[PDB]
Ligand binder design. Structure first.
Ligand code: 383
Ligand code: 383
Lengths: 319, 319
């Protein structure tokens, strides 16, 4: 037992683990409960997010359980991570509308409603409780200011000027990890490299809150093209996984025009085919490019999956 | 939590539970590990078996784990259950060939090769160890002769004359239950009504072997048509799930010619559609029979699934 880790590794979906070995350990020992999430900073997800929720779906394959945290509370605050300009609070309505779009999608990428598997939690439910006073006492007490300015996210912002709220974002997100880690048994939290800071902070908090009751954080790498261009972007902004923001057709082509070079990779990252199916699918590319089979079965997969069998046919027929 | 049981019940797939309530209990409490199996008394499964392996697949839906016991050891002996004429030992080669066919199929109905989910065990592995002496001592000691003549299977045979071997079949099968119940954690064993006897005996043995370390047996009902005819049979014997014994086409039609009456039922039993999808699919039948939509989406499902998307198209095109 170590196949799952064997492939994540093969495909190149592991940019960093907190405890490389220990992760390997429980993953070959007990059926883990891992989660991931997004703040509804919009009403549609987008190729950018498609990667790690897939990685979550690749776990569920082998027996594990994923959980999906929509940004019900941290949404309204905004994660300064990466950013280099303070955020802009959305309106309660907007967020309440945004999470209807963002969730509307997950509910298709995942099968919610089972007796034991995949839960869609809304951190609005617990973060909505904790008060000003409590917060400081119970959690604040154990969050050193010297660790926070440590965060590679904020370090930056600190320079331009970081508001308090972006600054206390990390404590809210850390609170979540522990809460699931306690409430549902979350031991691994998977997220993008833009999430290292936060991932690592959630695990430290519970270390002095109870002595990290067995938590680990994994990070999927970052999608990178060969044309040197901000993957995910189009004059049509970024490829939204919503049919009326980015349609099966526009979707389709995106994948169909995948610069031959950065192809097999994207096959590995985004498609549920084997190393053998891909391997074959690599020859077909290495010496019969006219047929453009790789770049074709890619798009086929991602479009049928994300959009539909029907919306694949409906799409393919526009060349 | 109680949806899975909620539907099994809805569809009518529960002919009997050993401990009705307790089953409900652990199924709403912990992720169970249930199994089922067949002796390779042939080289192809058949509609008859398609039902309970589906039921096993309906568990895996909600989080549970199935296991598949091919008849590697009990195969060679034959389960007199139901039968009313002693068996006929197969040849080691035959069984060794038969289990290549029988397994060749499961490996498509189930996804083996994961880190935590679905295992294909071969009881040849443990039953091949136990000797004449051991057997009597360790297990035989705790199997009363008065319980065995109790078995509704043999009771019958007893009348025509039941050889010792058919008679000791039940002890071999009971041995299995406990072994998984101990080896892998098997708590529920699902099987046809022709398997009550055996199901119930496996649980009794471990009751005096250690005090039934938490075991239960469930039984799927029996497929029954409205035309009053031995479901599963055709002049082409019985509908073998093998393409070269019973092909996508011959397969297809079978389902397509499903006597309108015993339809929705078969939709429930054999298809992964909702109560809503079916409900709609029941109207379409109740008042627009010309279209024959029910009997059509049925066959469609079962054929694509069992045989292939491709072998569905390939099939549908023969009307
Ligand atoms: N502050 C986090 C959100 C969060 C909210 C609650 C938690 O309990 C833990 C984390 C973040 O940055 N997430 C992104 C988002 O949209 O909210 C998404 C990004 O958009 C992704 O592309 C999708 O998943 C990763 C990856 O960076 N990430 O979580
Ligand atoms: N003695 C059992 C086999 C067995 C072998 C090992 C075990 O550990 C427990 C049971 C039996 O009768 N099984 C059938 C078979 O072909 O072997 C199958 C039947 O053929 C089915 O149609 C398929 O599953 C059920 C149902 O009656 N059943 O187990």
């Amino acid at each position: 037992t170590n196949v799952l880790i064997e492939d994540l590794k093969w495909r190149g979906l592991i940019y960093q683990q907190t405890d490389e070995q220990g992760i390997e350990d429980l993953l070959n020992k007990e059926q883990v409960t891992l989660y991931c999430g997004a703040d509804p900073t919009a009403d549609s997800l987008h190729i950018g997010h498609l990667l790690p929720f897939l990685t979550l779906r690749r776990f569920q394959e082998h027996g594990h359980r994923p959980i999906v945290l929509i940004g019900g509370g941290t949404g309204m605050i905004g994660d300064p991570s990466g950013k280099s300009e303070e955020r802009v609070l959305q309106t309660e309505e907007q967020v309440d509308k945004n999470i209807e779009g963002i969730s509307k999608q997950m509910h298709n990428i995942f099968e919610f409603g089972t007796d034991h598997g995949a839960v869609l939690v809304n951190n609005r439910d617990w973060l909505g409780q904790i008060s000003l006073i409590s917060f400081l006492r119970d959690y604040g007490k154990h969050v050193g200011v010297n660790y926070m300015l440590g965060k590679d996210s904020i370090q930056s912002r600190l320079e331009h000027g970081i508001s308090y709220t972006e600054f206390t974002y990390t404590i809210l997100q850390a609170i979540d990890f522990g809460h699931l880690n306690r409430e549902l048994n979350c031991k691994i939290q998977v997220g993008g490299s833009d999430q290292w800071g936060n991932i690592t902070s959630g695990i430290e908090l519970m270390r002095r809150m109870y002595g990290q009751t067995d938590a680990y954080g994994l990070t999927i790498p970052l999608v990178t093209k060969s044309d040197g261009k901000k993957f995910g972007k189009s004059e049509s902004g970024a490829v939204w996984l919503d049919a009326e923001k980015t349609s099966p057709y526009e979707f389709y082509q995106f994948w169909i025009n995948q610069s031959d070079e950065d192809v097999i990779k994207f096959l590995k990252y985004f498609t549920f085919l084997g190393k053998e199916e891909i391997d074959r699918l690599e020859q077909s590319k290495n010496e019969a490019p006219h047929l453009r089979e790789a770049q074709k079965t890619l798009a086929e997969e991602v479009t049928k999956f994300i959009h539909g069998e029907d919306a694949l046919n409906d799409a393919i027929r526009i060349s």
